[PDB]
Design an enzyme around this catalytic site. Structure first.
Site, PDB file in Angstrom:
ATOM      1  N   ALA A   1       0.812  -1.212   0.000  1.00 33.88           N
ATOM      2  CA  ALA A   1       0.000   0.000   0.000  1.00 33.88           C
ATOM      3  C   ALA A   1       0.849   1.267   0.000  1.00 33.88           C
ATOM      4  O   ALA A   1       0.800   2.052  -0.951  1.00 33.88           O
ATOM      5  CB  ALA A   1      -0.945  -0.008   1.204  1.00 33.88           C
ATOM      6  N   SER A   2       1.645   1.470   1.045  1.00 33.14           N
ATOM      7  CA  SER A   2       2.424   2.692   1.174  1.00 33.14           C
ATOM      8  C   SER A   2       3.864   2.534   0.713  1.00 33.14           C
ATOM      9  O   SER A   2       4.537   3.543   0.482  1.00 33.14           O
ATOM     10  CB  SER A   2       2.400   3.185   2.623  1.00 33.14           C
ATOM     11  OG  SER A   2       1.113   3.660   2.975  1.00 33.14           O
ATOM     12  N   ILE A   3       4.352   1.300   0.573  1.00 36.27           N
ATOM     13  CA  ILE A   3       5.693   1.075   0.051  1.00 36.27           C
ATOM     14  C   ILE A   3       5.853   1.604  -1.364  1.00 36.27           C
ATOM     15  O   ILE A   3       6.963   1.987  -1.753  1.00 36.27           O
ATOM     16  CB  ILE A   3       6.028  -0.429   0.123  1.00 36.27           C
ATOM     17  CG1 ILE A   3       5.884  -0.931   1.557  1.00 36.27           C
ATOM     18  CG2 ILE A   3       7.438  -0.700  -0.366  1.00 36.27           C
ATOM     19  CD1 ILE A   3       5.975  -2.427   1.685  1.00 36.27           C
TER      20      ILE A   3
END
Lengths: 398, 398, 398, 398
Positions: free
Chosen positions: A61-63
């Protein structure tokens, strides 16, 4: 050689899986530039009883933001992108903004470190201001479950361009994803080609073949399912969502092997500068050493959610090394980013090894550990488990 | 011995077959000069319920160019053919060409790598020019569905001899088939024997017994049928076609064992030179090593359609091994050619093994992997599947 | 129940198969309206080793005329067709033909029994004349190997519409296939719909569920191959041909069960008239008895090629019943039609049973034997074998 | 016992699957009240390599109408429903409708047989009228891809309530799904309970425990995936859709065993009437024989789309038993319903056995064959295959 740390890591994985309740989890541990452990526990598909395997494909998701930085770094190295100039140079579609009746500049560097005043899935400015004031002293949102398909980043810019700013740029740190949508638009404008093909070229260069953007129609092999607990404490499927509006911020599918390769490339690029003096037979890193030391330099007046000691620096969470008192806690320098989406949690952690006199002369880069964990469960904090696994593997180096 | 690898390969074959909708597919794998796996899935003849077997005879489309190249290499080694001299030396019937009113020369070396100015199934110059200009920044054609029978190679030249050139020779890469028809005319004139008779001797030397040109009247055992999907997405028979006008270009029928033998012979001829010094008990290769190295030497300003990383080299596709950066993708050297005929698709791939000091002293040639795949379905890309199968078999070498 | 006749007929099957070397043969024998024997000997597909079975699909050449005759008779019964009106009323595209400067008329009735002046695969006005005179005292033609595809009948009439009449209509018997193309055009005009979908409805009525027109594109299950012998006395494949210009005359596919059902229907329609007075619970035949008796009525000055005793009677060959002298040959009444195409041969034969006063009161129609034989070898005469098998099965009636 | 029938049935199934390139296919056959064969060919989940098994759960599209007819018949037998009175007694929300300004009545009987003027996924009246006029001489529509969730039938009626009728009720046949939505509303009104609860009660009574409505959130074990072919002739996933607005018309998930049980119950109810005199120990059917004879009685001026011989009869397709001519086709009595959904096809067929006087005394009901076929490929017609399988299993009765 590593028969002892593997069992402790498996025990920790069982601990976190039992405490949370995730139906499946996958871990990948790479030591000294080589993959030394891959494991999967549970089911990737509860309905069809499909077990978890190292080639399972889940949501990071945020990687994804980290990956975006790499592209930006490449556009910075060629000199085609300048961080200081205001963003309206590349994208005129973004309206000129004013705060309290004065002209305020919005720059790429401010967007990278979340120092602008863009909002994050919240519209009631009073609640955000109260939260920030309390700090000085999120899955209920409706935009998270959008279903519209957006053709490009320009069409997705309409979700937040007309809203006013929340804080004066460069003054207050507010984590947000729409800033990275603006960053993707800037990348598209400066590079001259579409964002997705540029990211595909980067993936091809780094050898991450499985990495791809999430889409329903194409057939993607070994794609995992995503689950959540409902009000009655029963497992159910998450609602169908479309992430075409946050490609750079929340939409990408990958395994643990690609994340391990990405971490190894970053570590080699970081550490090759020291070893360059000793030997000239070492290949250059993917990015220049100055860029790599710029990425992992913490930016002041920033907070890192998943550990209090860290600070945010170019889509990374960096914890520096210090020992203020004698015979007290000795902080270990490392860099980690944590991602959470609808029915998906992930962590990528890089622990560099401290270098000594003989190490630089004899050894060869990379020298460190990379730990990647992904599970198909919602709202799971995986940073501490990854740190413990990394330390356990680092204890018995030889 | 090769259980896991075979199982993985079988799954990959199923995946491509399922997505495409192919009625049948045949695979053959050779490791270190011996055959370790042959398989067939589906039906060779749907109407009569004939299953696919390792001895099924199917069409090869562009792999015939490899055999024509072997014939040309043998003639060149015998000293009866010169690559530099213009083709009017051998076939005066080809009219002298004049591009933009200036004298130009057409040579065998240019025809070999598609660098001449001959067209390919397209008679409108502006479409080719605009497509190539865009590139700088075929199953609908009527000539592909011919039925007239041509007795010899000189008759088939009237299709394209009167037409003007498209590009200046040696400047633009245009994949063409008529160039190899002219090459067949050159071979027939220089060798003093008919092209089919010479190719029969070449096949006999390599023990390629089942290989034969495609004709209607003779009885050919285990011949498969070719199919295609219509506008209603229902499987149907392809129209009757006569491929006599492009014997050297695309008019041969073969099984997977013959392609395995041809690939093994090529690999041995390539690799014999290194092992010759250590051991003097080895037989000579079919071609001299100086011809084999020129065979797989990539040519500048050429494009390999089935993989963007490789180039064109004497009727083959070659991907040289290189690693630009540490902890980044490293290419692996391999040679592959892909063909697509009316109703059939095929791939042949050769993956040589890198050699160390220990391997040279003790082991014997050939060392590598040869993979051949054929399916009776039109417009199927199979190069990636062959590469994945070869890499899967490589890991469990010992 | 029929053990003796089965073996005694299998002997004749092997005899006729060995005499001409046909790779395969299929036979179907039905007595008293029930299929009592269906056999297949040999290979339907030599290349893929596909054995012959009763559900094999092979070409029927001239039985298509017997099928078109049912459509013509049904249209005549409906009152939409007139036999004596000149055909120019229906198809004005046919020009007004003149014989030696005298007005002549072309009618449907003359076209039924090949009494018009339409040619047959021969374009020389003279060459046929001395042959006809000698008679009174065609596989080498190129027209049989035409490859053009025709969409509608009016287009297909262009092959013979401009040619002049060979003889005065209604005076000379000349077996031709173009007359049935004209008859198909007349059916098209009178019925107001297509020919093929009309024959489809007729086949559906008769329960012949596997009788379809021959086309390459559609998938037809259990289709069989057709072979011939060359000048070197070797088995070779027949050239690819298209029968789109003679749908009503020479192109259809069928099995032996379909022909058995068609013969049973014809026999029931021929015989129900006598049994009608005995029992009133008998359903009417597919055609009225008045039409059936006209169907099998021999026409003067018509020759039955495959049996010199009989004559031609409305698309059938009929041999009557007579006994000129005592203790001499006693002819048997039967109707048979023989078809020979490119690569196949077939025969259908109906042998009615003589009835007394007792049988009419006690028995129920049909009372007779129907035999159908198909072999995939070019130019084989099969009438005698069918007649002998019919007589053997008549011997063991009950 | 049924080995030959099983082999022949397997082959037919293979043929249809190959022809349409379906990823998976499941078949279930019940003979004389017992299940004798349940087979699965292919993959239920292409991405995760999940093979098809008898316990696979797939979509049934139009069989839900046949299931709702059982509820309607039960309510009619309870005396709580009247077919003649206008529907506005139960549902006042549906407005009174006018056709050309004359009063018309909309009744349950008209909607049961699709005889009213309600539309079907098409809004342009001119196109429908032109199509019907031409006939006298649905997967591209947007409404089929709705994502909105509807809580109850009253609000779901808003999609078509204001749209006027297309034809005068009782005069023209127009297949539609919204009529059964109104029927579901009527069932909710008259029953006094929710439609889904009543359907679950019926499913429990019929032992159809695996039949459940299609909802995304609940975990449904062994749920399959549904695929289609795109323009580039490649297999892809169908888009996410919601079927909550047509619960009674097009939304339900079921296996093949449930369909076999439903068919067995219908057959027993249809055939218990004849055997009641011979034996008095037989249990009563689920529905009265007078109800079952009405259910399977063809309605005039209705057309059966997948079989030209039959006609629509109270949510079923019934083919009559008749024989017009002797020694010709003899029709067989059977009832079949075919359902096609987005990316799925299914067919259910019941073939009763003709009974004589000697069969009643010794045999017991049910006496017939029930065949169910379900595949996960879009727009596949499986009626003829089911009929062939039923006949093949009928030949080897004992």
């Amino acid at each position: 050689c590593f028969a002892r740390a593997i069992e402790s890591s498996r025990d920790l994985l069982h601990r976190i899986k039992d405490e949370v309740g995730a139906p499946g989890i996958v871990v990948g541990v790479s030591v000294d530039g080589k993959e030394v452990w891959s494991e999967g526990l549970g089911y990737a598909d509860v309905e069809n009883r499909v077990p978890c395997k190292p080639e399972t494909v889940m949501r990071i998701a945020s990687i994804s933001k980290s990956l975006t930085m790499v592209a930006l770094a490449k556009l910075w190295e060629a000199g085609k992108l300048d961080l200081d100039i205001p963003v309206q140079h590349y994208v005129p579609e973004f309206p000129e903004k004013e705060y309290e009746g004065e002209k305020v500049s919005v720059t790429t560097r401010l967007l990278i470190s979340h120092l602008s005043g863009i909002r994050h899935y919240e519209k009631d400015i009073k609640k955000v201001k109260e939260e920030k004031a309390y700090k000085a002293l999120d899955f209920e949102q409706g935009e998270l479950y959008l279903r519209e398909k957006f053709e490009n980043s320009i069409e997705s810019l309409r979700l937040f361009k007309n809203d006013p700013l929340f804080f004066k740029p460069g003054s207050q740190f507010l984590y947000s994803t729409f800033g990275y949508t603006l960053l993707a638009a800037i990348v598209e404008r400066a590079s001259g080609c579409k964002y997705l093909d540029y990211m595909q070229k980067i993936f091809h260069d780094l050898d991450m073949l499985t990495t791809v953007q999430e889409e329903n129609e194409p057939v993607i092999y070994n794609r995992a399912r995503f689950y959540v607990y409902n009000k009655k404490k029963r497992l159910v499927n998450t609602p169908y969502v479309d992430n075409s509006y946050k490609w750079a911020g929340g939409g990408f599918l990958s395994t643990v092997g690609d994340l391990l390769k990405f971490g190894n490339a970053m570590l080699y690029g970081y550490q090759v500068g020291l070893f360059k003096n000793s030997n000239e037979n070492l290949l250059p890193g993917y990015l220049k050493p100055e860029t790599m030391v710029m990425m992992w330099t913490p930016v002041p007046n920033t907070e890192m959610s998943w550990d209090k000691e860290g600070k945010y620096a170019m889509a990374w969470g960096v914890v520096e090394r210090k020992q203020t008192y004698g015979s007290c806690r000795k902080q270990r320098h490392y860099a980690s980013h944590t991602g959470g989406a609808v029915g998906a949690s992930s962590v990528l952690l890089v622990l560099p090894e401290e270098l000594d006199t003989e190490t630089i002369n004899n050894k060869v880069p990379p020298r460190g550990i990379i730990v990647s964990i992904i599970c198909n469960m919602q709202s799971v904090g995986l940073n501490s488990t990854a740190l413990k696994i990394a330390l356990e593997f680092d204890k018995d180096r030889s």
